[PDB]
Amino acid sequence: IGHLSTPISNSSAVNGLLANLPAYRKGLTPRLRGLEIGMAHGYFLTGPFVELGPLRNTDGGILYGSLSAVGLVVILTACLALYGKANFSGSSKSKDATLWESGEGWSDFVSGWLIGGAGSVGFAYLLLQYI
C-alpha cells in the first residue's frame, strides 16, 4: 500500500474528532466554517498577551493585551489572503474542490475567520476585565 498498519492508525475515537472539526466537516458553507475556526483560535489568543505582556499590572493589562490579540488576527487574515492570492490563482480546479483544494470560498473563509477573530477576542476581554 502507501501507508502503514499499526494498531492505532485510523482509530475511531480520534477520527470522531477528526471528521467533526469545522475544517473537515460535511455540510458547512465556507463563510460559516471559517467562523467556528475564528471563534476557536481567537478566544485563547488573548490568553498569553494579558498575563504575559510588557505591562501586566496596570489598568490596563487585559485591555491593551487584548488589542494585540485582535492585532494578531489581522496579521493572520492578511496571511490567509496572501495564501489565497498565491495558492488560488483564479481558484484553479483540483481533485476535490474543498474549501482547501480548489478555492471557491476563500474570501468567504477569510472574511468568516475575521468575524470570530475579532468577536471571540473581545468576548474574553469581557470575561477577563469584567466577570
Binding site: 496579521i75 492578511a78 496572501l82 492570492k85 498565491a86 495558492n87 490563482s89
Partner: peptide
C-alpha cells in the same frame, strides 16, 4: 510626534505591505 508614530508605520506597517506584494509577485504564473 513623528518619532512616536512613523516607526511602527515603516518598521511594521509598510513592511507588512511590501513583503505581501513581493510574495504576491513571486508565486504568480501566466
Amino acid at each position: 510626534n513623528l518619532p512616536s508614530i512613523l516607526v511602527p508605520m515603516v518598521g511594521i506597517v509598510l513592511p507588512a505591505i511590501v513583503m505581501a506584494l513581493l510574495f504576491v509577485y513571486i508565486e504568480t504564473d501566466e
